[PDB]
From a paper:
Allomorphy is a post-translational fine control mechanism where the catalytic rate is governed by a conformational switch that shifts the enzyme population between forms with different activities. β-Phosphoglucomutase (βPGM) uses allomorphy in the catalysis of isomerisation of β-glucose 1-phosphate to glucose 6-phosphate via β-glucose 1,6-bisphosphate. The active site of βPGM is located in a cleft formed between the cap domain (T16–V87) and the core domain (M1–D15, S88–K221), and these domains reorient in response to the binding of a phosphodianion group in the distal region of the active site30. Substrate-free βPGM exists as two distinct conformers with different activities due to cis-trans isomerisation of the K145-P146 peptide bond on the multi-second timescale. Allomorphic control of βPGM involves the isomerisation of the K145-P146 peptide bond situated within an allomorphic control loop, which leads to either fully active cis-P βPGM or partially active trans-P βPGM.
Two monomers are present in the asymmetric unit, each of which overlays closely with the cis-P βPGMD10N:βG16BP complex (PDB 5OK129) (chain A: non-H atom RMSD = 1.3 Å, chain B: non-H atom RMSD = 1.3 Å) and their corresponding interdomain hinge closure angle and Euler angles are consistent with a NAC III conformation. Chain A is slightly more closed than chain B. In each active site, βG16BP is coordinated by the substrate specificity loop with the 1-phosphate group aligned and in van der Waals contact with the carboxylate nucleophile of D8, while the 6-phosphate group is coordinated by R49 in the distal region of the active site. The K145-A146 peptide bond is in the trans conformation and the sidechain of K145 is in a solvent exposed position. A water molecule occupies the vacated alkylammonium cation site, and MgT is coordinated between this water molecule and Mgcat. The remainder of the allomorphic control loop (residues A146–I150) and the specific geometry of the K145-A146 dipeptide segment is consistent between chains. However, despite the slightly more open interdomain hinge closure angle in chain B, the conformation of the allomorphic control loop allows the formation of a hitherto unobserved interdomain hydrogen bond with the substrate specificity loop (K145NH–G46CO). These loops are too distant for direct interdomain hydrogen bonding in chain A. The observation of MgT in the same site within the trans-A βPGMD10N,[name]:βG16BP:MgT complex, the trans-P βPGMD10N:F16BP:MgT complex and the trans-A βPGMD10N,[name]:F16BP:MgT complex indicates that its accommodation is correlated with a trans K145-X146 peptide bond.
Author numbering:
A (entry chain A), B (entry chain B): 1 to 221
């Protein structure tokens, strides 16, 4: 059986996309960039902080010094962190708490494989820390948006190979990253967005242990 | 007693999966899409031609016009049709010819409920057409994945309700389709693929009239 589930954070466990967006938008407007709208923001979902800033600078044909780049990312992060102070257990997505309980009861490892360096604080705000066996640290691994390294690290952090794991993602690039890791992806979202080459569910209420096991068994030949 | 048996084609009466696979892989290579391997191909079984092409495009997040999509499906089908020109009566799966004889002699209706538009040609190549009371036409009803409509149409084409029928399938989604139609499914293959809540035989040599009768009786209580 799969020995671990590797969880995305934003779009799976909860979603703080609106606050990421608002913080990026506010930063962009401050530095004279006006194109950071919700459509553009779709290109930032799932993407590292630094690659997100780079996409925003690129949009505006803007270039800044290394020092200024760090300052800008920090400014956005400080605003984001202010905005997520009131995240609570009520923000856990539908079905997720029960899934975590069931995985734990079945001694299946639970690892966070989020791009977000704010993951630990968010899990604490949601009272989920006790379920997580490990959190892969995005500062420690390759962080391009389709890079498999965060998923590989999450599996390894709980003593298992990606080949022995399921990964849950909302991002197209994250699904590709899971494939490249060797883990089995199960996406959450619409076919129009994620495609049909992997198993997807419409929303997290469909992520049950029974469903994960059914998919796993079918996919292991 | 049941009044009809609704037969899948590929994986039940014969299997042309290898030729479907080779034709899709050739098409994918022409358009520069990687990932159409034998493992991926498992998810194309019981899927319509168009839904199969969509999955392949989705491997690469490729988008095409409606005309381009039609052209690609046509090119794959042309290649597939060439590759099945040598199908013969020796390709009929084990036990199937005797089952057809026994059903006919017991005045049980026989209908094809395949997703494949190439079904009639294949039955002719195998010298089986005369055993079939009807062929449900997957160009005229929904027939991909878990669509019950192809099974409903097959039953109706021989004057019976699905509730009066057994359906035979090798695909998990096709088993679901049979269940949703109201017919009694009997799968062939792995429980790991098809489920633990229907009768499954390991291979088609187990599909005998006596066995179908025993299952029908057992499932009526
Ligand atoms: O390090 P941080 O600035 O907190 O977040 C990094 C990224 O985390 C991602 O989380 P996920 O991969 O969806 O869980 C978000 O989707 C993305 O919008 C964000 O830029
Ligand atoms: O219309 P065509 O391109 O000839 O075939 C459509 C589909 O027929 C299905 O037949 P079945 O449902 O297993 O008998 C095959 O399993 C599937 O792989 C194929 O794509
Ligand atoms: Mg996400
Ligand atoms: Mg992610
Ligand atoms: Mg609140
Ligand atoms: Mg089949
Ligand atoms: Mg079928
Ligand atoms: Mg031959
Ligand atoms: Na923990």
């Amino acid at each position: 059986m799969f020995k671990a589930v590797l969880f995305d954070l934003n779009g799976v466990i909860t979603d703080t996309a609106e606050y990421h967006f608002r913080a990026w938008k506010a930063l962009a407007e401050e530095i004279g960039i006006n194109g950071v709208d919700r459509q553009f923001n779709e290109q930032l979902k799932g993407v590292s902080r630094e690659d997100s800033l780079q996409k925003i600078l690129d949009l505006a044909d803007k270039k800044v010094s290394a020092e200024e780049f760090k300052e800008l990312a920090k400014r956005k992060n400080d605003n984001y962190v202010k905005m997520i102070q009131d995240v609570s257990p009520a923000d856990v997505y539908p079905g997720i708490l029960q899934l975590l309980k069931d995985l734990r009861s079945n001694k299946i490892k639970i690892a966070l494989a989020s791009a977000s360096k704010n993951g630990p604080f968010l899990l604490e705000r949601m009272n989920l820390t006790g379920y997580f066996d490990a959190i892969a640290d995005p500062a420690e691994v390759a962080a391009s948006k389709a890079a498999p390294d965060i998923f590989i690290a999450a599996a390894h952090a709980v003593g298992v190979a990606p080949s022995e794991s399921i990964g849950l993602e909302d991002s197209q690039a994250g699904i590709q990253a899971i494939k490249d890791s060797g883990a089995l992806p199960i996406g959450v979202g619409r076919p129009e967005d994620l495609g049909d080459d992997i198993v997807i569910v419409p929303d997290t209420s469909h992520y049950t242990l029974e469903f994960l096991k059914e998919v796993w068994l079918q996919k292991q030949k």
